[PDB]
Symmetry: D2
Amino acid sequence: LPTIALLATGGTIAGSGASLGSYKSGELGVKELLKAIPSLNKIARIQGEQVSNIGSQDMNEEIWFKLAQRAQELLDDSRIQGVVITHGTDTLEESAYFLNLVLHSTKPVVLVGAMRNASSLSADGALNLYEAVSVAVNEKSANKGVLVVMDDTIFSVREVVKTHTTHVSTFKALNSGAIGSVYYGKTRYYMQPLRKHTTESEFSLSQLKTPLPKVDIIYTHAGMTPDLFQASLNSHAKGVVIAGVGNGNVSAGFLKAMQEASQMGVVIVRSSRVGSGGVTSGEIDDKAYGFITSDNLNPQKARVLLQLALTKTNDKAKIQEMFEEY
Amino acid sequence: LPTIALLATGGTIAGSGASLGSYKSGELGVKELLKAIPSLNKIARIQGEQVSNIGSQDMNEEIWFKLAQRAQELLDDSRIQGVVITHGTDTLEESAYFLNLVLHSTKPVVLVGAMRNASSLSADGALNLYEAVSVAVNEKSANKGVLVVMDDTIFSVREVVKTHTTHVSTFKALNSGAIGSVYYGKTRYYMQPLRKHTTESEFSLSQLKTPLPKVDIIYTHAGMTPDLFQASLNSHAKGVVIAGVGNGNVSAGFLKAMQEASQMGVVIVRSSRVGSGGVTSGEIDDKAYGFITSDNLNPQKARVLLQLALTKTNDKAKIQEMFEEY
Amino acid sequence: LPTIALLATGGTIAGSGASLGSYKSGELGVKELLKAIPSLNKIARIQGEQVSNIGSQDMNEEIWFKLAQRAQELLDDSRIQGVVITHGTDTLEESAYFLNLVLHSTKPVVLVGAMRNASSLSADGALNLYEAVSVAVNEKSANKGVLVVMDDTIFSVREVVKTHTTHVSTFKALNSGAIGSVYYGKTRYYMQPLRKHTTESEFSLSQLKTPLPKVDIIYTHAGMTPDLFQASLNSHAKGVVIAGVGNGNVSAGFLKAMQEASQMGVVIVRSSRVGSGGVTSGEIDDKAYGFITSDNLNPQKARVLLQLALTKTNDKAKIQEMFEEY
Amino acid sequence: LPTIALLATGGTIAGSGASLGSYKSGELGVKELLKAIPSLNKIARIQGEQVSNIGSQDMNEEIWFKLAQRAQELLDDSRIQGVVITHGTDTLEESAYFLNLVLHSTKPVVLVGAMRNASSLSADGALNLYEAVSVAVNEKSANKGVLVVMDDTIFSVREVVKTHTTHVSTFKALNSGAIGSVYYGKTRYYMQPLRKHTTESEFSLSQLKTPLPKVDIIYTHAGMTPDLFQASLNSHAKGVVIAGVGNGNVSAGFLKAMQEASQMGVVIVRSSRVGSGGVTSGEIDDKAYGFITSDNLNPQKARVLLQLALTKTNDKAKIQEMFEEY
Ligand SMILES: N[C@@H](CC(=O)O)C(=O)O
Ligand SMILES: N[C@@H](CC(=O)O)C(=O)O
Ligand SMILES: N[C@@H](CC(=O)O)C(=O)O
Ligand SMILES: N[C@@H](CC(=O)O)C(=O)O
């Protein structure tokens, strides 16, 4: 059978206590996760290890770099056929995108979590993990970038987002859709992601060091004032992503603050709070002010790309090109 | 015919220049809006006026109070059968919710905008406005709270959100659905909203003064630090809404900052960045720290309710009760 | 504790064998369903019984009438506080609507199923059933018509449809939305259904006899010919629902066949194959031909209402009025 | 500028009269369509012609073959850079899929329609057509199979379906998502379709003759009986697609009828009425009876593939392989 490395980071998939909720994220080790499925041993040899044991609300760059380094080392090993990472669902979409930009392998990397804790009635993690391992061993899963497998569905990491606080079907791809299906391990792909990933990426771990450039996200709303934006500047942000209203829009006072920050060399990205769709110029002439539009990346994924962009360049045109290509 | 007051605030529905985009939000007056439909004059006498002429990204409390005061005065007039407000789509959902909580009338109040500027190819505002006026005159539109009519659909103000940066069908109700349909003016309702609105609300304009209590919204993501949260505190926020990860979750450092702020009397509301679903206790014991869960309100609508809550009380239990009732 | 009657009909919620699929619909009895939850005994006394043990693809009028008669008798009993019906998901939406039109009680009736068989990894039935019982005991569940509880969500029977072949979140309300949420038994309602149900319905079991009037559903597509439509007529259909293309449209040859059938007294309802939205007149002048538009009912629910309509009247205007009211 | 052939077939995009509905599908010629945009002449030379002038509810094989033959001849011409087809929305998804399987070119073919008639308030056709022409000239639109452009979105023909009776945003890809976006002509692709299309297809016009093999679609519901199925057999159907309940399920009497028909050489495809998801074996052992599962194709697109399959083979395994590959 193929060997799959399983890298556990924590998350509700490993959470425990209760059957009706009542749990901590974060709790059981990477070997109890395997005891509840082992029809698993029919499809892969699993090499499990613990990278961290946290709720993903506590995900940070130290763990991202440990996770990415371990994943890359295993992907480089000819005895490893693919990697599955168990992860809390809250920030899974950010870790997936980060790995999609920094890992260099054609072998499948699949992130998976659970929206119900492992001891819940009707817990969802066992079948999600079976499926995830099924996708990671499938030959057609190679060369598609980092994948997320949840609730019988296969997503590309750039596209997938957590859209609901609690539903088991919370992950969706609101702009471009799921790239495949997996039903009790039967895997089918219907789409190939076109944005640059993994082996095609200019970012790589050997070139990166934590702390990454500081990038904050600023929310907007009626009655908004740029006081938190200015505080971000004062705390030495190198980039700021705005979760703007509608098509990345902001108040006049915000815009003047953004213009001044950009003129000082801070990179300003216009994203949106709305949850889907691309941000475009038009009401704001981005090129007039040096602003970057975040494509159809939501604020947290725009931040991931911006942080990596800023390790390479401060050139606005080049950064806008990265948002067109990644 | 019935008389409908039309209160114009600006927005892309009044934006102009271009046929392929290229426009300012904000631009044409409340009487050109009526020239392009007037089968309108077959269903209502329209009494139009300009309250403001801005893109809704510049919506603020001065305009909210002017708008609400004018709407209430017209609703109190026996010669007015309903009110239509034209508004930019970016913050329409916030203005609608604010009016839903402060206006006291059973007569229909309908907000409407356009996702394409008035001089676009296939501009959407003319039919949206025809429809909006159609809903506002319909007898079944009374006593349902403030309404939003967009793209052939009737929404309750608490439920409706802008979900996409640019699509004409951007407004959706992701938790509870649209309450009715309107197709070339033919109006049908299928649901009655149950949360408290308008005549049942404890908030009213005569009790409110701007500036409302300061409430900021703090975004969260992997690698988050509470530095912007602390800056909000330092700028004298009376309440803070957190756009938390997943089910309103935050990092350990965030949680400790939130706990300290709550113990000092700042009201902390856990909302979510994800876009849909209710925030619940569980991983966070809200009652242990005095935190409020934002129900299924997204961060910007949670902020609207919190600002009004704070004019009445600092009592956490009472504020959580408002989030259960409004 | 309240007493809830549990009426089992079969379905994948009672299906068994396998952990990876491989099961029959239909298989385990109404008392094993209760062994896997019994935190249940903390919220209700359950009086279970088997009405049938079938996959819902074999649901028919004999079982509908047995089910409805038993439900009505239990609802009439002062010792019964509500009723939960376990049911296969395939035709759950039809049974729910039928019961919504024929049962006369204000007490809650809740239908529930499972998309994974009971012995699957991550089977969904235990928590769906816990939730269903939670909703059925809740005082706010009364007087809302028949309910469907699935996947943490509360639906009104008229609105809910199975939209996906296999996902656990397959049930949705595509026109009007879910009316509430239930999360580990915590029940909240946000909407009241407005169409006529249960105690407000003119249909009642004591007036109905099986076989109900024969009503067929005819599908449409490019290259369509009315040969199957004519066969329905030849097999003595009293009504025919057309699953038309787009806004209930049909080919010229279909239309002429429909016109002739209507002139002979067969009642023709224009529904749609598309899955959502109301069917309207316009391209077809329904009143010219005596046709009925099916509102926003999909073909199978339009058929349920039409069958009941035809026990009362052949009057087209009265039947169109039923499609406006139910 | 590039030359784009525009092939008009009719549809609401060419419908006229009325500003509030009231129109015939079908009505204005392929040259008035061009008068209302001509910023068009800035992006392409348009060579327009009328193939037909019908509502798409009257689409049939005579027009499909005329349309396909003309499209292929133009695609074979070195002076033609791409083809846009204007079409009624009702059966657009079927024509698109048929062309995706029979046309052999790498140049873009784009189908487009309008959900509001051309003389409606806020008619959607002008911008949809501008966009469609924009996509058809874009170099990245080549080699992706037949495309559908509607409402600012780019779809692959296999994936796209009309989901709502009347909304302008009715077309969606419920399983795999849109492959790109187009906003006032700015075209971006995020996904490549993987199922076989156009140049990779084994079907081609030179091998096909109308009438194609007869294939009917049979709807299912509670209380179903195979009488219409038997009538299809009696009318010499070569294949039958079942719009089954849930995961392609049917009553016991249906199943026995299906088994007998298959044993006689009629090819039986299990699709679903639900609107999304793949049909799988499991409750029905398809290989036991010779049945074909329709993948995630809805009944009308399953019919298109089945008709073409039947011109090539009667071999069940080979036909199931086509449903795995196309
Ligand atoms: N807070 C949890 C939520 C989950 O995994 O569902 C986490 O992200 O670790
Ligand atoms: N920025 C504009 C967007 C719109 O109306 O569509 C506004 O909200 O005023
Ligand atoms: N065929 C099964 C499907 C299910 O329950 O999920 C039934 O409806 O009984
Ligand atoms: N019945 C029309 C509907 C439309 O185009 O929107 C057609 O398909 O031709």
